[PDB]
């Protein structure tokens, strides 16, 4: 009855929204301005207060001091070098050598020290954020979860059981097995659970264009790592960052080996990382260099094999808990049909097995739908299978 009368009372008030929101001022789509109500702190006071009394105080870098006198030696980006002086606002204590300081443009004197450079590509690989993977989702390798977790978090969450016993806990661990076995997914539970800085590193990100460029990124990595109290450094696919040294005739693959040796030097010897724990994860460990494989760098040596039967059944219970199923199916029969299978393959059996229910017109899959998944995923993709030259890791 009020068919148009609801429409025009809708539209005139939705338009009159705009007819007064243009009278407010949010408009004039900018090139980088604030909303016009947001800025009124610097309206009359800080316009002539944060601008007219305020300087520029261009930052510099200190070379060194000298004895008996301030008489500082400063350095800048391109220009020359000066003998400079403090301000009265700061002590000469934390004006230590090799430090960035804010410096006025006329008297050229030091105002405030600055934090050092972090080279923000090293900043970007701090994780800032955690995944949601629970250790319950990594079922089937519980003893590896325990033997890893006793190294990763137990001195961090309890630094009294090791100290009051009088032992120093290990700091290094590699994780290795076939692909798809739950190594990366296993590290996601660590980045879930832990609390300190979790700085991730993928070995194919350090390959640089210049000579020795990647080795300085290792340096800045461990420099910002030693600033923190405790830190966890993650390493992924470390075959890219080094296998070994084999150089014969013409120098081939030299550049990566220097970054690898730099990583060795930053790991052991000469007042070590202290409270910095590392965690590698690779595919084929046989390529790796033995001086890298020395304990004191890679103490724990966790293998990820295939589950025997029951870890597989547990993985069936993991990926098959949250899907519309027939009630009276059994998973042990399915686990008897997969002697050598990874958890990702089991997940693909489940996720395909639901697609069989989506094929015709069924809301919950059956046991024969699972059997339609087993022969296709296991036995029809069996040309590829991705495993057997990685069981020997070759």
């Amino acid at each position: 009855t009020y068919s148009r009368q609801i429409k025009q009372v809708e539209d005139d008030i939705q338009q009159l929204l705009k007819k007064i929101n243009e009278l407010t001022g949010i408009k004039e789509s900018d090139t980088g301005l604030a909303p016009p109500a947001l800025w009124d702190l610097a309206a009359d006071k800080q316009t002539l207060q944060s601008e007219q009394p305020l300087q520029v105080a261009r930052c510099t870098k200190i070379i060194n001091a000298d004895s008996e006198d301030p008489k500082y030696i400063i350095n800048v980006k391109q220009f020359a070098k000066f003998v400079v002086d403090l301000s009265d606002q700061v002590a000469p204590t934390d004006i230590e050598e090799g430090m960035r300081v804010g410096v006025d443009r006329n008297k050229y004197q030091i105002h405030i020290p600055l934090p050092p450079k972090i080279d923000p590509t090293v900043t970007m690989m701090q994780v800032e954020e955690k995944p949601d993977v629970t250790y319950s989702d990594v079922g089937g390798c519980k003893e590896q979860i325990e033997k890893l977790r006793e190294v990763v978090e137990t001195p961090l969450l309890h630094p009294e059981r090791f100290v009051n016993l009088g032992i120093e806990p290990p700091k290094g661990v590699l994780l290795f097995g076939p692909p798809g076995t739950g190594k990366t997914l296993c590290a996601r539970a660590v980045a879930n659970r832990t609390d300190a800085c979790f700085i991730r590193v993928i070995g194919s990100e350090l390959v640089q264009k210049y000579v020795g460029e990647g080795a300085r990124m290792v340096r800045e990595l461990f420099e910002m790592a030693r600033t923190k109290k405790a830190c966890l450094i993650f390493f992924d696919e470390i075959d890219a960052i080094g296998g070994a040294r084999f150089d014969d005739g013409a120098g081939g693959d030299n550049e990566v080996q220097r970054t690898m040796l730099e990583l060795i030097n930053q790991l052991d010897g000469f007042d070590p990382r202290g409270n910095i724990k590392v965690l590698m994860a690779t595919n084929r460990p046989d390529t790796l260099d033995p001086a890298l494989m020395r304990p004191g760098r890679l103490d724990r040596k966790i293998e990820f094999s295939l589950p025997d039967l029951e870890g597989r059944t547990h993985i069936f219970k993991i990926h098959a808990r949250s899907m519309s199923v027939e009630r009276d199916i059994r998973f042990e029969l399915l686990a008897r049909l997969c002697p050598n299978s990874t958890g990702a393959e089991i997940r693909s059996v489940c996720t395909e097995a639901g697609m069989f229910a989506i094929r015709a017109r069924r809301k919950i899959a059956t046991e024969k739908d699972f059997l339609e998944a087993v022969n296709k995923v296991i036995k029809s993709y069996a040309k590829f299978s991705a495993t057997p030259r990685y069981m020997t890791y070759n």
Binding site: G32, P35, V56, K77, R200, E205, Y381, F384
Partner: protein, 384 residues
């Protein structure tokens, strides 16, 4: 502007009447709380006066600077265009947010203080690798296959258009899609119809153009590539001819096969990283399926493996009917004689014979294509 998301109803409901009249409550009551401003304290206009007060703070010589760090108490170290960086302060019309390390900003001329931020003109590479429009016709152009069309709609189209079927099932779509067979079988031609069908942002890259001449520029191109792939929204990344990274060696690449290898390590990360990946589907195609790394072909990184066989003869005649649809076919010809000419002819062979036969008609300025055009057309196309 994002005022009220309740736009459900879809009939003459009184809720719709009373809710729009309660927007009329927040707007009639408070348009009578819009009248009084310049009535009581005029003192300025505030539409341009305070605006020109900002514009009289900031000078016309607006130098363009670059962020590298942030200290929260509105001062930070910013980079000049020269390189000699400063330690200037930050204003209050700077809307303290769109500020990331590396961002283009607007500084003062005198004290170089952080006046404004700058919208980024992006990079041409996104427009280079980004497909703009729909390429060609639909799946009805294909013909004869009809089985894996359900597979590609299954893994790609149906998750996009129907986000109900996986939720009533309690399941997620399969991740990776790979396409393999003999050459010229329509592997790219299917992705053409996919790029017709989808509304998602579509990217396409050849596996040959992955490789570079500098060191690490390959894996860096991978990292910024998946950066571009993620930073939009639902997206489809297509990879053509990924065997070519492993087959052909070129002397432009300074690193040998152990630079290609590290590029494969970076890509091998970018398929199955620990990071939250997002809504990025991956469709790949090759013809040498046996050459590349099986570590990339594992379920989890590529879930669906799709082979394209050679066309059988009853599908061949369909493809002839497709490529001879809109042409003035003289009745001289018999397509069944053209079927068994080659025992393993591809779909490209049919279209090549058709187009070259049209070229033979246009040599003689005719309008229809006769039988001898096909007779010497198969000699021209096939036998050389």
């Amino acid at each position: 502007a994002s005022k009220l998301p309740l736009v459900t109803p879809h009939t003459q409901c009184r809720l719709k009447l009373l809710k729009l009249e309660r927007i009329k409550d927040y707007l009639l009551m408070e348009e009578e709380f819009i009248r009084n401003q310049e009535q009581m304290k005029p003192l300025e206009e505030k539409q341009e006066e305070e605006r020109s007060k900002v514009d009289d703070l900031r000078g016309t010589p607006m130098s363009v600077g670059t962020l590298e760090e942030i200290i929260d108490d509105n001062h930070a170290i910013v980079s000049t265009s020269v390189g000699s960086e400063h330690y200037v302060s930050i204003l209050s019309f700077v809307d303290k947010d769109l500020l990331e390390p590396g961002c283009s900003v607007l500084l003062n001329h005198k004290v170089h203080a952080v006046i404004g931020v700058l919208m980024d003109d992006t990079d041409p590479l996104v427009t280079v690798m980004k497909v703009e429009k729909a390429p060609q016709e639909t799946y009805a152009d294909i013909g004869g296959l009809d089985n894996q069309i359900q597979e590609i709609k299954e893994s790609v189209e149906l998750p996009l258009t129907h986000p109900e079927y996986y939720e009533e099932m309690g399941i997620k779509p399969p991740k990776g899609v790979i396409l393999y067979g003999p050459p010229g079988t329509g592997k790219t031609l299917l992705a053409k119809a996919v790029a017709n069908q989808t509304s998602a942002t579509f990217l396409r890259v050849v596996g040959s153009e992955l490789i570079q001449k500098y060191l690490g520029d390959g894996p860096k191109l991978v990292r910024e590539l998946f950066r571009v792939a993620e930073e939009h929204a639902p997206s489809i990344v297509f990879i053509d001819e990924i065997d070519a990274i492993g087959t052909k060696r070129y002397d432009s690449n300074s690193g040998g096969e152990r630079e290609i290898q590290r590029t494969m390590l970076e890509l091998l990360n970018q398929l199955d990283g620990f990071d939250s990946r997002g809504d990025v589907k991956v469709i790949m195609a090759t013809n040498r399926i046996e050459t590349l790394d099986p570590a990339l072909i594992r379920p989890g990184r590529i879930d669906r493996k799709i082979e394209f066989p050679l066309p059988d003869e009853k599908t061949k005649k369909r493809i002839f009917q497709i490529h001879t649809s809109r042409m003035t076919l003289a009745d001289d010809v018999t397509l069944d004689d053209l079927i068994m000419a080659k025992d393993d002819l591809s779909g490209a062979d049919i279209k090549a014979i058709c187009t070259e036969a049209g070229l033979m008609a246009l040599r003689e300025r005719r309008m229809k294509v006769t039988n001898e055009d096909f007779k010497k057309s198969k000699e021209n196309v096939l036998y050389k």
